[PDB]
Amino acid sequence: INSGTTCSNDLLYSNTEVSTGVCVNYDLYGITGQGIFKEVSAAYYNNWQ
Amino acid sequence: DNETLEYWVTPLSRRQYLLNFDEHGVITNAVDCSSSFLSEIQCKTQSFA
Ligand SMILES: *[C@@H]1O[C@H](CO)[C@@H](O)[C@H](O)[C@H]1NC(C)=O
């Protein structure tokens, strides 16, 4: 629950930009919460992570 | 040409480990928490030293 790609389109919204620097709410493909984003140049993700 | 077929098999069970992840996110060390006394100290301190 609250992670994955089998999503329910009962409540439909539009995709927004991943804005950095500001305190926002987020709904990142299931993951919900509040916080601040910051774009980084990461190299530790595989094709399945 | 001096070749050999080898197929080593061991059973599995559900148990707790202590895993070590490095900078790049690779598992480099592991310790079975119920194998010895040093493993007990390593899993109670959550440290590999
Ligand atoms: C604080 O406010 C300024 C402008 O009012 C904004 O640019 C900045 O992102 C805000 N900082 C946080 C952490 O929300």
Ligand SMILES: *[C@@H]1O[C@H](CO)[C@@H](O)[C@H](O)[C@H]1NC(C)=O
């Ligand atoms: C294969 O192993 C034997 C061991 O007695 C050795 O004498 C022989 O030279 C080996 N053959 C090759 C091609 O390495």
